[PDB]
Design a binder for this molecule. Structure first.
Ligand SMILES: *[B@]([O])([C][N]S(=O)(=O)C1=C(C(F)(F)F)[C]=C(C2=NN=N[N]2)[C]=[C]1)OP([O])([O])=O
Length: 353
């Protein structure tokens, strides 16, 4: 009743403030979905954002990679104590076959940065990168937010399931989540629904191919689909047994970096959380530098979870709180500062609770 008015108060000004052509905000509360749409999926085409608009999720893709890993661990196909060598035959007995599937997933190999270097691109020279991989920091002790790390994990998960990564998500994970319009590759019959992203010059753009892009930042979805994914995270008991387990796996905190608990993809906090706690989670320091991990001391009673994502032309934020049975999704076709994403959501979900 007030939900639409709250989103209007808190999300709608951001379109003018950052010259964002288009935005989709979804709220799910007590199993009722609310969708709110603003502006255009394509400026040049004057095509409006609607329930069919496909946006790039950026690193919110990692939540799908994490979920696919939980599914594989609960079908017996993998173990999070394993190392890559067990699956990627060409890496076995190399120094990367010393780091385990969990550590890759949660960014602790000691020696992986946010990107593969630009020169790495083909299937052949990704293999060579990890062959010549040599340690630096103490395996398992330092959190380094990393596309190569989680990418490796996804590629491994795919190996364990026999099928390439793109097929794991589209033939296995997305259907098991009831998602009808989420893709690693947008088919031809859906290109008309794929938004333009818009860069900082407001030029229209879409995501560039890169090494192990699919598992790290390569998923595209709609607002109804993302609201179903949040529904699943809030109420997994209803889903097939194996995806229930996969989902519960993604909620288990593994370590803390001060006040952010790292789960499989999801960031976890004690609920209620202060706004500032939610922001610090995505600081330069956490995001860009290595940081020393600490074991979980206070196991939070009531937990919330979040994740940001960005491609060059798109912004995503996703948040849910199990015990309040509430969640939010924001999708945009121009990046806005992570902090503005996190803050508007804070004010809406509080105002409703
Ligand atoms: B993720 O979405 C990964 N972010 S990223 O920083 O590695 C990244 C970006 C961008 F800089 F936008 F974030 C963009 C692209 C891109 N590739 N082709 N077109 N754009 C790839 C990676 O997590 P967070 O939210 O922390 O940035």
């Amino acid at each position: 009743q007030e939900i639409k008015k709250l989103v209007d108060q808190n999300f709608k000004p951001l379109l003018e403030k950052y010259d964002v052509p288009g935005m989709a905000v979804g709220v799910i509360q007590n199993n009722k979905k609310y969708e709110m749409y603003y502006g255009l999926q394509s400026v040049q085409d004057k095509k409006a954002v609607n329930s069919n608009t496909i946006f790039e999720l950026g690193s919110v893709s990692k939540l799908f990679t994490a979920t696919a890993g939980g599914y594989a661990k609960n079908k017996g196909k993998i173990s999070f104590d394993d190392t890559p060598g067990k699956y990627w035959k060409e890496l076995k007995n190399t120094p990367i076959d010393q780091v385990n599937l969990l550590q890759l997933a949660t960014y602790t190999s000691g020696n992986l940065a946010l990107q593969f270097p630009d020169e790495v691109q083909t299937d052949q020279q990704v293999l060579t990168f990890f062959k010549d991989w040599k340690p630096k920091n103490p395996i398992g002790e330092y959190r380094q937010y990393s596309n190569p790390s989680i990418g490796l994990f996804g590629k491994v998960v795919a190996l364990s399931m026999n099928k390439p990564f793109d097929q794991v998500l589209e033939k296995t994970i997305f259907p098991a989540l009831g998602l009808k319009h989420s893709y690693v590759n947008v088919p031809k019959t859906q290109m008309q629904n794929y938004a333009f992203g818009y860069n900082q010059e407001n030029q229209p753009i879409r995501v560039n191919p890169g090494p192990l892009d699919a598992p790290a930042y390569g998923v595209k979805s709609t607002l109804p689909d993302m609201l179903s994914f949040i529904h699943a995270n809030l109420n997994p008991q209803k889903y097939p047994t194996d995806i229930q387990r996969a989902i519960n796996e993604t909620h288990q905190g593994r370590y803390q970096v001060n006040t952010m608990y790292q789960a499989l993809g999801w960031e976890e906090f004690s609920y209620p959380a202060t706004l500032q706690t939610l922001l610090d989670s995505n600081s330069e320091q956490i995001v860009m530098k290595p940081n020393k991990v600490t074991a979980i001391s206070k196991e939070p009673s009531v937990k919330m979870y979040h994740k940001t994502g960005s491609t060059s032309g798109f912004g995503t934020y996703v948040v849910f709180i199990p015990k309040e049975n509430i969640g939010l999704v924001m999708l945009t076709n121009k990046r806005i500062p992570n902090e503005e994403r996190i803050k508007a959501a804070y004010v809406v979900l509080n105002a409703i609770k």
